[PDB]
């Protein structure tokens, strides 16, 4: 929350291999083309410091939206008006977890896996920064959501008494992003001799949409998270993988 930005803000400025340093040359060449992202190799985090990756491996849902605001304070040291929140795309290679053995222990942990993509969906809209006004008080405000944990985790407040939820979203001043909703099937060479091949459903953020055609072999690095819609049991949730960084092969 505090000062973990500065422990990451020094990582982008000062990481350096033998002669030419990478994350101030990958951040500059992705602004002139107007690409607005960054690609962190995850082996270079733990070579520079181990205490940073200790926080990121334990509780990733609350720290990656802190690194996204640690980039957009550095891109104002290079460009000098509209610079949005940057997106963090990461990739690594530790050990593949097969799709069959995903226990109840891997809830909110960085997990990579593999498989074949069955289907896609149509794009959508999620809100990032919206503007609210009350109906009676007409007291304007601005809620900026940046975290992503699909239904509702951050909603409207109840007072600025007035009525039950007096708040209106104003559609004339906001910003929006995209979502994609894939599906992923395990590779048939890890044969289910008495089973059918299972599947999972992922989500994708603004810069990974429309990247992969149905029918390919991918490797996917994401957060194994959970959501509780009723769209069949008591206190039952459902699993899904929030993708942050799809490392496909050569498409061939």
């Amino acid at each position: 929350n505090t000062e973990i930005i500065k422990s990451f803000k020094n990582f982008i400025l000062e990481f350096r291999l033998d002669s030419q340093f990478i994350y101030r040359d990958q951040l500059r060449n992705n602004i002139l083309v107007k690409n607005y992202s960054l690609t962190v190799n995850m082996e270079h985090l733990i070579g520079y410091n181990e205490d940073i990756y200790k926080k990121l491996s334990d509780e990733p849902s609350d720290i990656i939206p802190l690194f996204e605001t640690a980039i957009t304070q550095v891109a104002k040291r290079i460009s000098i008006n509209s610079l949005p929140t940057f997106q963090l795309i990461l990739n690594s290679n530790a050990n593949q977890i097969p799709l069959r053995d995903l226990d109840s222990e891997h809830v909110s942990k960085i997990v990579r896996l593999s498989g074949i993509i069955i289907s896609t969906s149509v794009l959508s809209s999620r809100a990032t920064y919206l503007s609210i006004m009350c109906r009676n008080c007409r007291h304007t405000t601005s809620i900026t959501i940046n975290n992503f944990n699909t239904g509702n985790t951050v909603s409207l407040p109840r007072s600025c008494n007035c009525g039950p939820d007096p708040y209106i979203i104003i559609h004339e001043s906001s910003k929006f992003i995209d979502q994609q909703f894939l599906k992923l099937q395990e590779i048939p060479e890890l044969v289910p001799v008495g089973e059918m091949p299972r599947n999972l459903t992922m989500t994708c953020d603004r810069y990974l949409t429309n990247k992969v055609i149905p029918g390919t072999r991918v490797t996917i690095v994401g957060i194994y998270s959970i959501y509780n819609s009723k769209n069949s049991g008591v206190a039952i949730r459902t699993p899904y993988i929030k993708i942050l960084g799809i490392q496909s092969d050569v498409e061939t």
């Binding site: 226990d103 109840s104 809830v107 699993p239």
Partner: protein, 260 residues
């Protein structure tokens, strides 16, 4: 009761000092097979316990819902004298009681077999997917802090634990997705075997809950032998039938054997 501390020290001698057939105590050579498969499941026979102490054999059929908690809590400190660094690998063992011949095929289930260890065979019909369960209700109270201590709603009950006078008054609580221990879940139904049917009558279904170790042990079409318990599930039991207070009955499974 508070007589449980007399129970804890005196079944511990039947994990260490029960020997048979010229040495090689079978529950000293069993905990060494934990760890090397790392599986949090002690096998315990019923004939190997009933021949020694006939008191505790009665206290399995009477009320195993409170008996098996004490039989699990001391089961940790049996392994701890072998593997002292075992607090961090699942931190929990549950037990696997073997044969107890109560019910013949499927249909002997009256009131007189309620809340008791029942053993029953059958045939798996169909099964759902694998899901997580809560197991640790952690509030989202706005007046208190959002850690708030571990509270347990671990049943088919969905406890109505209201938050009243938390920090200064009744803070409104929800659930978060933070730091709780989920566990697996899979409902699989079961019907009567086609070999031992009475003439003319259709077979009968029953719903069986598996929990946290025994998921993906069935396959549709197997002669499975369930040794579960038998309870009285609420939470939507015949919602359109309030003139007949008729309750739903689900077997919670405690072991699974294949065909023999």
């Amino acid at each position: 009761p508070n007589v449980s501390r007399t129970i804890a020290r005196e079944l511990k001698s039947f994990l260490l000092e029960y020997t048979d057939e010229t040495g090689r105590s079978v529950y000293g050579a069993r905990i060494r097979t934990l760890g090397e498969m790392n599986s949090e499941s002690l096998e315990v026979n019923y004939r190997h316990l009933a021949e020694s102490k006939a008191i505790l054999a009665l206290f399995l059929a009477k009320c195993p819902e409170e008996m098996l908690k004490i039989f699990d809590l001391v089961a940790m400190e049996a392994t701890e004298l072998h593997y002292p660094d075992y607090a961090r690998i699942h931190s929990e063992i549950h037990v696997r009681i073997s044969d107890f011949p109560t019910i013949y095929s499927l249909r002997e289930l009256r009131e007189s077999n309620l809340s008791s260890l029942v053993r029953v065979t059958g045939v798996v019909t169909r099964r759902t997917g694998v899901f997580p369960q809560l197991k640790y209700v952690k509030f989202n109270c706005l007046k208190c802090g959002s850690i708030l201590g571990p509270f347990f709603q671990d049943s088919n009950e969905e406890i109505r634990i209201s938050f009243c006078t938390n920090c200064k008054s009744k803070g409104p609580f929800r659930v978060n997705g933070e730091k709780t221990v989920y566990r697996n879940y899979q409902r699989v139904t079961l019907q009567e075997a086609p070999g031992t049917v009475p003439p003319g009558r259709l077979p009968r279904h029953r719903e069986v809950i598996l929990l946290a170790d025994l998921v993906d042990v069935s396959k549709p079409g197997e002669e499975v032998e369930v040794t579960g318990i038998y309870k009285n599930n609420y939470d939507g039991n015949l919602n359109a039938k309030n003139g007949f207070p008729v309750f739903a009955t689900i077997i919670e499974a405690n072991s699974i054997k294949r065909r023999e």
